[model samples]
Target: PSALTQPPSASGSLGQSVTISCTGTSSDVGGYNYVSWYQQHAGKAPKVIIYEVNKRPSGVPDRFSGSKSGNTASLTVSGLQAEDEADYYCSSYEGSDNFVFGTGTKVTVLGQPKANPTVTLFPPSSEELQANKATLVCLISDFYPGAVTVAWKADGSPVKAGVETTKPSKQSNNKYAASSYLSLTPEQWKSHRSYSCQVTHEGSTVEKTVAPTECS
Candidate 1:
């Protein structure tokens, strides 16, 4: 009654069709026809594409279609375009005063990501490092669709431990940003030549390095 399913991701090349499915209960899709699907892209609001099972709103292209069998409803795209790549969400009325929303699906076009990421590294301020702890920040910005890689190095050696990273998240001004943190005791910083923070996007590697400066 509470679980509606959708794939986390769906992808297709230009001109190829892709279908996203949402599952409901006998109390919803299989029972009635009040189902709707929405298309959302980064930094934009959702738009209704199909409603009342398979009806389209004004001006929507005919290539967008919907269907249902039993408790599952699906949305299909024909002759898909690059602009069609986005997130799709499905909703169904739960009979009374409630509604269930599918977990959402991300549609990706098999080409270059929309944008490149700009990266920067920040060294910990003075007092904090003197307190025997050092935390370095690697900031990744301007990436599109939240795809980027952040890795750390200490004095040219691969660093896999003592690192924490947030999942790529949206930023202001229509971009994606991710911050990776590498923390260590001041003693570790005093020993390594420098710390390297590397970011990779679409096969390009951009990086920055840090060293202890005048404490502050």
Candidate 2:
């Protein structure tokens, strides 16, 4: 009634076929043939791959197809390519100007979008130091798969306390960004020439060393 049902994930090897399903009640997908499928890739708007239950929009490849049966609509990718490894969402008209969307499904091809995140380490400003405060902000951006870890260190050793992290959230660009902050006294902060932020994503590690801004 409220949320359309979909398996959270569907995966296949390169050149193989994979299918994702969206299920809704008679008030939505089953009530009408207005079901559409959207393919979303990082850094781009979702492209409507299929509309009106089983119709591919103009210029969309035939390899991406759709179908409807009873209460469920399906999107099938044949000869799946590396680019097919992304997210798919289903939309359907629920009558009366009401539309509903599936929770979305992630399609994974064996190896694709092996992209790395860009890391930036920002040190506290002179005013912050004068205020006897410091906030080291570690920025992790442009990552895929929505999975990443941030670790901190000071003077070549692990830092455990005084850390604040925000949820890894999507940016307007469709990539993801996460922020981690290390707060300490300015005296203790700038004393370290070796504060670093390490981000581990998809079995890879990127370390960024922070350089404190001197007090004026």
Candidate 3:
């Protein structure tokens, strides 16, 4: 009964507006004016944009505004600018000493073109080979619009265990990047299984593959 919910995303173009909603039960948002909204960018801390349902902190732009009705709270961003693109969250105090935060909404400003990510697959390092294990690396970079999925396979079969993918983070070039790793035993690597890394972004998919190399 304490969980808060929000739309996974909302979007608008430059000079446009978008509204996101946060839904909670009466014990939280509906019972008080303690609801607050926050704005955050990738790899950064969340900053309060609106507090107490509709109050703005000092120095925050007027473009961002908040309102509430019953158990639902809303944040509207007007006259959208490039810098206004970020994730927005809502939180409310549940009396006494309890508080809850809503699932975040990602706000996208859609004027810029979507760029495809570059996929690079690297063979396992020799250092780990000595330990009887191998690890493959996949590098995904220079992508715009920031959403991508990574998957791994061995000899055309899906791989689930020993696989990890990192969240995309902004780079110095203003594009996004991420990494995926796949682990294997030396017996598996030396058996000549082709390991592939697949990165899907926007509407297209890019893939790279590698096999174990001769030991030094």
Candidate 4:
């Protein structure tokens, strides 16, 4: 499916509640509710704050919560902490092994410690498909500096053979970015119906899936 859309900012007082919403077409968030939330602190790897919508992973503070309505998902930070000033992200597991993330959001502490840095996914407006070509470009934008990886999965299984990935290059404003071109036949794309791009750095992981937009 297309990428998820989210607001760039949202704020509240130290003891107030704040929410971040992520919206997408029927193919993405609309297709499923496998949403997850993450928090990142400055100079540290991201932490999985919430998973499967409202379920928080072990050790996640009780103040952080998540909920979903139709094609939109919301993450609420209650009794916000000074360290909670870091950025937040939302993700969903689209069918066919497709997973996606919202555009990163920065959370300023407001008289507290500087929030952590984060990475997010901006929906891809369009994709380029070439006739008779065995490769397709999965375009993603608005990511932070770090190492990223992309892989192809067929029929819910990982394809380790004949897969290749590229390094992220510098983008505008000195921001580091990159993309992966998977060489697979049109038949393969149709038959597999699943693809993913995963970004990793400092032990933190973020990923996106193409199940919502897969064209057979």
Candidate 5:
């Protein structure tokens, strides 16, 4: 009754139509007529596109529409343009002032070239080493479509703690850039370990590794 789930992504060719769905329990989408859709671009706030199930805002184009049936709500984008290639979300009234939001879906417009990211891993600087800590930095650059996933690994196994990754930021050439950091103790860094940074863009993944002996 409290969870709204959405597909991770949807795609269509230019001028075609794409639909994203959000599903919830009867206590929410099925029980009420209050459903809304939102559009969001990277680094920008989400904008309301459809409300009251099918009402488009004044400025929102007719190409963006919404509907609901049973326990599911849908947002359809017709004549998909390059600008429509962003993220979409749905929300519904659950009654008594409660509401729920979908997990969100990314919409991609095909026929455009997809750019893979370049990932580079850098070892700890002298200053950090002197402080008894080692920080590995992974720089992900020159990617299109912005969204990406970053992970840290030690000797091929996932390393969850002391990892931080930044959101992708737009570059001057319209590409994207992001960075991830993995913190470790100096002792751990010097223990003949192979640390890696993995970056996933679109459907492909690239990784960069660094060893203590390879530090520069």
Candidate 6:
């Protein structure tokens, strides 16, 4: 998996609507529908905007919405207000005990911190598929304090063989991102259908996999 793809910056009027896109490789979001959205204000923890793709969490304003197409997930903020100008993040469930966060998108509110970083993940859609080679990718995007990893597990067993990962490059905003990838044969995927992705930071596990798809 690699870092989630995000825009450098976007501008909108106080009452206008704005959309931010989170992009990932096919392994992550291509055939998955587990995308989510969050909102974070200064000095406060993040709040859920959208979860399980388009389902809004309790109490979230109607102005926030989520959508997806192929390998990309999106969040739209309508009736944008100054109070809404903060950092927004998107996430999805990668297989195993892993979740991926999109690069954060900063809402200017006509001020500094031009771009606040966010996170997102993508999970496989269905359990049934043709027997063949398959890949799983995880991405984290728009992160300020960079550097992260993506790991895969098979039926609660860790398979280190043939696993690959990558780091992000410097974006125009001076922030960084990264991604990780895992490959497996259809037989391997079926035998160890239960898999997961883990995100680590400062020796602490911020996220883990809950419900990765099973082979059909």
**Model 1 C-alpha lDDT per residue in residues 97-209, reported as the tens digit of each score:** 88778867777776644766788899877777667678888888887656566789988888977888777776776668888998887777777888999876544678898
Scanning candidate 5 in windows of ten residues, the lowest lDDT window is: 1-10
Tens-place lDDT per residue, model 2, 1-216, is: 557877644766887788889887775677687688888899688888787988677898878888988999988888888877788888877447777788788775644454457989988877777777778888888876555667899988999779976766767766677888998987788678879998776557799876655756
Per-residue lDDT tens digits of candidate 4, residues 1-216? Answer: 545766544555588677778887775675575678878778699888778878878787777788888888888888867667777787777446867787766654344222212333232223433344455444434444333345445555766555555555546654455555567655666665556655443234466566534343
For model 2, state the Cα shift of residue 176 in Å.
16
The lDDT of model 5 is 0.79
TM-score of each: 0.52, 0.51, 0.53, 0.49, 0.59, 0.50
lDDT of 3 at 138: 91
Note the Cα lDDT for every prediction shown.
0.78, 0.78, 0.79, 0.61, 0.79, 0.64
* lDDT tens readout by residue for model 5, 120-209: 899888888877777889998987666677878998898887999888787988777889998878777887468898876555888888
Rank candidates, TM-score, best first.
5, 3, 1, 2, 6, 4
Clashing pairs in 5: none
Q: How many backbone clashes does candidate 2 have?
A: 0
Query: Which candidate would rank higher by TM-score, 3 or 6?
Result: 3
lDDT of model 5 at position 88: 81
lDDT-wise, the better of 3 and 6 is 3
Residue runs of model 4 more than 4 Å from their true location after superposition: 111-216
* TM match of model 2 to true structure: 0.51
Among all candidates shown, the one with the greatest TM-score: 5
- Candidate 4: clashing pairs of residues: 1-212, 1-213, 3-123, 41-116, 42-116, 85-115, 86-115, 86-116, 99-209
- Put down candidate 6 lDDT per residue, 21-131, tens digits, no spaces: 788888567667767777888878878788888888878888888898888888888878878767777776666778787777666443323323333444444542444
Our tally of clashes for model 4 stands at 9
TM-score of 1: 0.52
